[PDB]
Structures are given as structure tokens and as C-alpha cells.
Homo-oligomer: A and B are copies of this chain.
Amino acid sequence: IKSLFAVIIGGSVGCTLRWLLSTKFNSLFPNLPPGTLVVNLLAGLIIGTALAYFLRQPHLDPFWKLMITTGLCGGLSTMSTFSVEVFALLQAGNYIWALTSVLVHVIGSLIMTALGFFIITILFA
């Protein structure tokens, strides 16, 4: 039950952030909706910084770890919205941007995870 609250509180903050950022910004550039990109890149960054930080602090409460990763990053990021965007582009005959969206979301999200991890790893002494 305590773990469930971490997932719900974190998840609700993440989903809310995705909803606000997506409705505000996605329509500005519909070939690669920037609201959905920014939340995936940001979640990649946070999970990477979490990866490195939680390694150095092994005695932290599993509550905070679960709220940040499964909750916040889990709620904030999305594979499903990413898929319809690409599917729609594929149906629209816009293959160049379908391919670009797949590369920028995936390669970009991994790069942000790397950045988050290595920035914290480089900070420690």
C-alpha cells in the first residue's frame, strides 16, 4: 500500500505534466510534436540521473526511488502517444518524418539517459 501511493503520486504528477506540455506544445510542430518529445527526453534525463544517484545512496527509502522512476518518469514518458504520432505520419505518406520521429525519440531518449547518468557520475569527486 505504501509502494502504491508512491506510484500513484509520482504517476499523477508525471501524467499531468505530460498532459499540460503536450496540449500546449504538440500543435506547434506537428511533424515531430515537441510536447511528446520533451517529456520523453526529460524522463530519459531524470531516470539517468536517478540511475547514477541511487547507486551511490544504496540506503535510500524504496518509496522515493519508486516515486521518481516507476511513478514520475513512468507517468511522464510515453511509448503509446509516440506510436500514434508515427502511425499517423505513416498513414499520411510522410515517411521522412516518421523515420525522423523514431530516431529522434529513441536515440534522443537514450542520449538523455546517458547524459543524466554521466553528469552525476562526473560530479562525484
A75 and B76 alpha carbons, distance in the complex (Å): 8
**Residue-by-residue, is A89-103 near B (CB-CB < 8 Å gives 1, otherwise 0)?**
010000000000010
Sort chain A's interface into a size bin.
35 or more
* Dominant secondary structure at the A interface: helix
* CB within 8 Å of B: which A9-55 residues: 10-12, 14-16, 18-19, 22, 40, 43-44, 46-48, 51
A90 / chain B contacts, CB cutoff of 8 Å: 110
Q: Are A19 and B51 in contact (CB under 8 A)?
A: no
Q: Mark A67-78, 1 if CB is under 8 A from B, else 0.
A: 001110111111
> Are A11 and B15 also in contact (CB < 8 A) when A79-B44, A81-B69, A83-B110 are?
yes
